[PDB]
Design an enzyme around this catalytic site. Structure first.
Site, PDB file in Angstrom:
ATOM      1  N   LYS B  11      30.350  50.451  53.404  1.00  0.00           N
ATOM      2  CA  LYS B  11      31.651  50.740  53.909  1.00  0.00           C
ATOM      3  C   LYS B  11      32.679  49.591  53.488  1.00  0.00           C
ATOM      4  O   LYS B  11      32.173  48.445  53.751  1.00  0.00           O
ATOM      5  CB  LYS B  11      31.236  50.620  55.278  1.00  0.00           C
ATOM      6  CG  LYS B  11      32.565  51.298  56.310  1.00  0.00           C
ATOM      7  CD  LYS B  11      32.664  52.657  55.962  1.00  0.00           C
ATOM      8  CE  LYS B  11      31.998  53.679  56.913  1.00  0.00           C
ATOM      9  NZ  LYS B  11      31.982  54.812  56.622  1.00  0.00           N
ATOM     10  N   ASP B  57      28.449  54.828  57.521  1.00  0.00           N
ATOM     11  CA  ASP B  57      28.763  54.856  58.707  1.00  0.00           C
ATOM     12  C   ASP B  57      27.713  53.896  59.647  1.00  0.00           C
ATOM     13  O   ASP B  57      28.278  53.258  60.504  1.00  0.00           O
ATOM     14  CB  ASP B  57      28.706  56.496  59.243  1.00  0.00           C
ATOM     15  CG  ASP B  57      29.293  56.477  60.696  1.00  0.00           C
ATOM     16  OD1 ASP B  57      30.580  56.404  60.803  1.00  0.00           O
ATOM     17  OD2 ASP B  57      28.444  56.709  61.660  1.00  0.00           O
ATOM     18  N   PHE B 161      58.108  22.411  31.504  1.00  0.00           N
ATOM     19  CA  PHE B 161      57.464  22.916  30.455  1.00  0.00           C
ATOM     20  C   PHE B 161      58.129  22.849  28.962  1.00  0.00           C
ATOM     21  O   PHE B 161      59.279  23.393  29.034  1.00  0.00           O
ATOM     22  CB  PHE B 161      57.434  24.454  30.962  1.00  0.00           C
ATOM     23  CG  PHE B 161      56.326  25.363  30.263  1.00  0.00           C
ATOM     24  CD1 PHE B 161      54.993  25.038  29.911  1.00  0.00           C
ATOM     25  CD2 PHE B 161      56.909  26.559  29.522  1.00  0.00           C
ATOM     26  CE1 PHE B 161      54.246  25.629  29.033  1.00  0.00           C
ATOM     27  CE2 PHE B 161      56.114  27.195  28.675  1.00  0.00           C
ATOM     28  CZ  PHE B 161      54.676  26.953  28.632  1.00  0.00           C
ATOM     29  N   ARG B 178      62.447  22.521  36.820  1.00  0.00           N
ATOM     30  CA  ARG B 178      62.320  23.885  37.000  1.00  0.00           C
ATOM     31  C   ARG B 178      61.517  24.118  38.543  1.00  0.00           C
ATOM     32  O   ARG B 178      61.118  23.304  38.921  1.00  0.00           O
ATOM     33  CB  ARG B 178      61.626  24.634  35.909  1.00  0.00           C
ATOM     34  CG  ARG B 178      60.348  24.475  35.932  1.00  0.00           C
ATOM     35  CD  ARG B 178      59.545  25.291  34.972  1.00  0.00           C
ATOM     36  NE  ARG B 178      58.088  25.029  35.056  1.00  0.00           N
ATOM     37  CZ  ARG B 178      57.123  25.961  34.371  1.00  0.00           C
ATOM     38  NH1 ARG B 178      57.533  26.802  33.519  1.00  0.00           N
ATOM     39  NH2 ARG B 178      55.680  25.490  34.568  1.00  0.00           N
TER      40      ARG B 178
HETATM   41  O1  URC Z   1      28.442  60.699  50.511  1.00  0.00           O
HETATM   42  C1  URC Z   1      28.192  59.900  51.463  1.00  0.00           C
HETATM   43  N1  URC Z   1      27.545  59.004  50.660  1.00  0.00           N
HETATM   44  C2  URC Z   1      27.246  58.089  51.604  1.00  0.00           C
HETATM   45  O2  URC Z   1      26.671  56.948  51.373  1.00  0.00           O
HETATM   46  C3  URC Z   1      27.635  58.284  52.942  1.00  0.00           C
HETATM   47  N2  URC Z   1      27.575  57.434  54.099  1.00  0.00           N
HETATM   48  C4  URC Z   1      28.290  57.914  54.934  1.00  0.00           C
HETATM   49  O3  URC Z   1      28.275  57.588  56.077  1.00  0.00           O
HETATM   50  N3  URC Z   1      28.837  59.159  54.618  1.00  0.00           N
HETATM   51  C5  URC Z   1      28.399  59.369  53.156  1.00  0.00           C
HETATM   52  N4  URC Z   1      28.490  60.332  52.404  1.00  0.00           N
HETATM   53  O1  URC Z   2      53.729  26.683  33.268  1.00  0.00           O
HETATM   54  C1  URC Z   2      53.668  27.591  32.449  1.00  0.00           C
HETATM   55  N1  URC Z   2      52.867  28.055  31.551  1.00  0.00           N
HETATM   56  C2  URC Z   2      53.090  29.099  30.697  1.00  0.00           C
HETATM   57  O2  URC Z   2      52.366  29.528  29.971  1.00  0.00           O
HETATM   58  C3  URC Z   2      54.541  29.683  30.530  1.00  0.00           C
HETATM   59  N2  URC Z   2      55.062  30.420  29.869  1.00  0.00           N
HETATM   60  C4  URC Z   2      56.275  30.741  30.400  1.00  0.00           C
HETATM   61  O3  URC Z   2      57.075  31.464  29.761  1.00  0.00           O
HETATM   62  N3  URC Z   2      56.511  29.873  31.112  1.00  0.00           N
HETATM   63  C5  URC Z   2      55.475  29.176  31.318  1.00  0.00           C
HETATM   64  N4  URC Z   2      55.165  28.127  32.246  1.00  0.00           N
END
Ligand code: URC
Ligand code: URC
Ligand code: URC
Ligand code: URC
Lengths: 300, 300, 300, 300
Positions: B11, B57, B161, B178
């Site tokens: 989940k 679930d 830089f 900068r």
């Molecule tokens: O196709 C599913 N797989 C799952 O693992 C799952 N778990 C769930 O709650 N519903 C579903 N559906």
């Molecule tokens: O700190 C920086 N690294 C980079 O590699 C990079 N390249 C860029 O255009 N600006 C900066 N600034």
């Protein structure tokens, strides 16, 4: 004994919109690009000497420059080109990871045909790629992941869940009929880079959708396996596919307090919590490729 | 030879809000909880036999039940308790990953004292944990990651830089002053589970913020290393820390077209793109624990 | 002399998913519903006597109950039914405002035909309605707003912007060719409630899209007027339409520093800031109906 | 007889970050700014003649320019200054609406004192203003709304809800003890523009929070009235205040199925749906100012 471990840096979420307009019938490529370089950037962290560091600002400039100079067809090819490019520009770099997502656009329908230069977003999931390139010349290796994200799909029947483990905290009733709704995130790994990217993507996407709809589901777990195994059976060039699917619960509202029946008709679409069922289907006969997946989906 | 590979399920985003009210001075614990079980769920994917599967679930019910039965003090202990509980309830499971975010609340100020039962969200970043438990009895092992996400911080000077690699696509001007603004995402790994979780968290957070402010920055890379190393030097119980910081660009706006100076005063805070600088700081005398980090930040 | 002014209350964002399944070919209605009641709730605020107050919990129950008892076809009819229902249940209520948004689903394509019970989100804007009902019996009046939100569209040519007012802070170059991209939010008001809701919605949507694509644009202002006036000319039953369109700037990247031309091909899609151009087109010959718009888009 | 009706246009979400650095102790102003002009822009919509239109890009430039030229102290004064400025620059304009959000920053704590130039976001709600200026010279009028958005607050007791209307669809149990949690959105109108904006804002915010905490609540309706009236009683310079509060439901979880008591301790924080309770508190001896509220919170 405190030292710098793994590290990477680049520009995140460079939105590049490329228009092909050699004929009055325009085509669009709408992209979001991440670059990440890896290599000998130890001094840049420990002492602050940036001599090895190519600025992320330049990595962004390079995305736009190559969008013109090389073009943008399949995002896998564009990502491969960017990876090899940064290795040539950054001698301290040992590898580059380029992730791209593409937002699809359709032509606006005008009098039954698509307009030459007016478009509307398609809005049905994001095509993705994650390309890793390591080494140079004869030691160069590359890996291509492609994927789909936010593909929102649902079945209103053909979905069961029963016979599960019942413990003292279980209140879930078994069911032979429920809604199964998800927002699919998936990525799959190609065995090599010699692939018709657009053709395989369209077929994989169609296979995932078809299997979701037509397989009678005994659980989201079993659906995801049926979807992923159908893809590998149709595509020997794919080594493995990982699928991540929320179970966005649609609860059958109890209307008996209002004197009404509810024969699977009125549902409450709950936001949180949601089941999260995640599975990979793999070819048993090819080696794993962990370099392809490093820092996917993220660094930490 | 197509087979089920790595999988997990549970989940996601169980929002539990726990009130301690033994006295009129209430305290609150405001949590977002993810559960994920791993083990022998092959049949549940391949044939659809759910006998091994404890429903997501039920895993949701268990969060609420144990929030009363066991209480919620430090989220690390609650996640450890959930991990062991599921292993007791699900024989097929070989391991559990329990991740929690906590949203901090302050008491509302009334005449210079915090109110007994009125609160306002603190709003300065999420406290996180990722707890993995594998095995049972003598074979049991557990790992605790704690972290902070969405900690929005900025310095308006003490950031430079310069001296970076310059190539044909580089237009970035070197600078000695900068803005450096970021939203820190960090996770660190404890060597053991015998930790005063709240005391260490508070110390780590204050070291991160203090080093960010006081360390003169030659690059985001170097600031992150300085923050990470200071945490490891002050806390031998921490094995490693990973930092992920966007460089949220604040561009000095060119006001010369309007007849005005702009000596580091007026900035445009750009949303995208942003630099993404990611670094790991590690103790070279302790071994890695990949098990702790598996499917962090996500499965795919 | 401090008194209670305007007030309203109800349940916000009731997600109701209704399935029609009298035949094996299911149909889905996916809705997000807001209720708001208005009337004599003064004592409920000033003294805390809730005698007049029908709980928001009950207003939610009523959404689900009527979804079964009355059905859900056009969301305008469902909103009208809810409004009249609450007036019959709540004698202190003088009016009810019911807002609904609908998320469209397509059938998953299986072997060239849409599946009976498997669906994918269409993802091209939200159909909306805002229905206000005031009074009872012979004094009952009702007003229907319908609309579209988050309709993401773009033209890659046929868009100009020149001849504008130039002041001392203006740096914008005039142009005869640019991208025009927006995410359209629009609501229109019907003269009466005797309307074929689904037929008018499909035609309005098609008119807005067609006019956007085919009208040569001299400004987003002029596009929005051409879109709204085309709708009113085709629909005498519509009294007025309000359109709100961000100008999501796609900036032509300067590639001259990289030795490249950019003839309208490579763009940076900026997030913020964006122009916000907002306009209403109205029938000059019908009265305004402010009751229809009260607390649209929100209370404050 | 189809005509252009109400319209407005401007630049939305200009993120300006202003640093005060006359001394080594820097201060920051972190703003999001919307401009919207109203006036005679009919031709710009109907024929496409943009002669009257000051480009939204210029309106963006003006925010940054005046952030230096005029400074940013109280956002009300900055919004008043922008409103008058645009009326000077755009003869066709009859009025301007300037809306600003400010994000508060605290100094990072170093040895018990705030650092000179290191900050962390405060995170407790956005301070807002909505300033409208109409006319020029003797005919000029202006109105100031100030407000707070996303102020997340909760009480774990001292909240009841009983004695409400019960109908056939009511299942809500009356209660004498529940959680009351909300995210407050409020805007109030000042009688004049001769106000110590910062002092009043701080006072209003503390009265709102204090009344929420200490007032025993018989309903969200009554809490909102008590908060609003207390603000008006303490601040004669405020003409009216509108409050919009979701009732973010924290459901007491039924733990009896698990053999456990739950005496107001373990709650499920539901996301949607939520009660939405909206009330206006007004001085009956002052007239309304609809001009101040026009197109607040939005145009349509
Ligand atoms: O196709 C599913 N797989 C799952 O693992 C799952 N778990 C769930 O709650 N519903 C579903 N559906
Ligand atoms: O700190 C920086 N690294 C980079 O590699 C990079 N390249 C860029 O255009 N600006 C900066 N600034
Ligand atoms: O169509 C436009 N209308 C404007 O008002 C405007 N302002 C701006 O900068 N670009 C545009 N484009
Ligand atoms: O304070 C409340 N006001 C309501 O109108 C209401 N309705 C409801 O279900 N709970 C509550 N609570």
């Amino acid at each position: 004994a405190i030292v710098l471990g793994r590290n990477q840096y680049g520009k995140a979420e460079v939105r590049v919109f490329r228009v092909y307009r050699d004929t009055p019938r325009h085509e669009v490529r709408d992209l979001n690009v991440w670059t990440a370089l890896r290599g000998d950037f130890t001094d840049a962290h420990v002492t602050g000497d940036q001599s090895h560091v190519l600025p992320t600002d330049t990595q962004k400039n390079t995305v736009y420059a190559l969008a013109k100079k090389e073009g943008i067809r399949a995002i896998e090819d564009f990502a491969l080109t960017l990876g090899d490019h940064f290795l040539r520009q950054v001698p301290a770099a040992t590898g580059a990871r380029i992730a791209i997502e593409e937002y699809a656009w359709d032509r606006i329908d005008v009098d039954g045909t698509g307009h030459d230069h007016g478009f509307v977003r398609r809005g049905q999931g994001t095509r993705t790629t994650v390309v890793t390139v390591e080494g140079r010349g004869d030691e160069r290796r590359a890996w291509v992941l492609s994927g789909i994200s936010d593909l929102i799909i649902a079945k209103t029947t053909g979905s069961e869940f029963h016979g599960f483990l019942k413990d003292e905290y279980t209140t879930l009733e078994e069911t032979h009929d429920r809604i199964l709704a998800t927002s699919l995130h998936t990525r799959w790994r190609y065995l090599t880079t010699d692939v018709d990217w657009d053709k395989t993507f369209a077929s994989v996407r169609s296979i995932l959708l078809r299997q979701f709809a037509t397989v009678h589901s005994l659980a989201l777990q079993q659906t995801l396996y049926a979807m992923g195994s159908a893809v590998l059976e149709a595509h020997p060039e794919i080594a493995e596919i990982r699928l991540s699917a929320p179970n966005k619960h649609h609860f059958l509202v109890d209307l008996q307090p209002f004197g009404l029946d509810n024969p699977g008709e009125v549902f409450y679409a709950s936001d949180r919590p949601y089941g999260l069922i995640e599975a990979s289907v793999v070819r048993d006969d090819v080696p794993e490729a962990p370099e392809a997946w490093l820092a996917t989906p993220g660094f930490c």
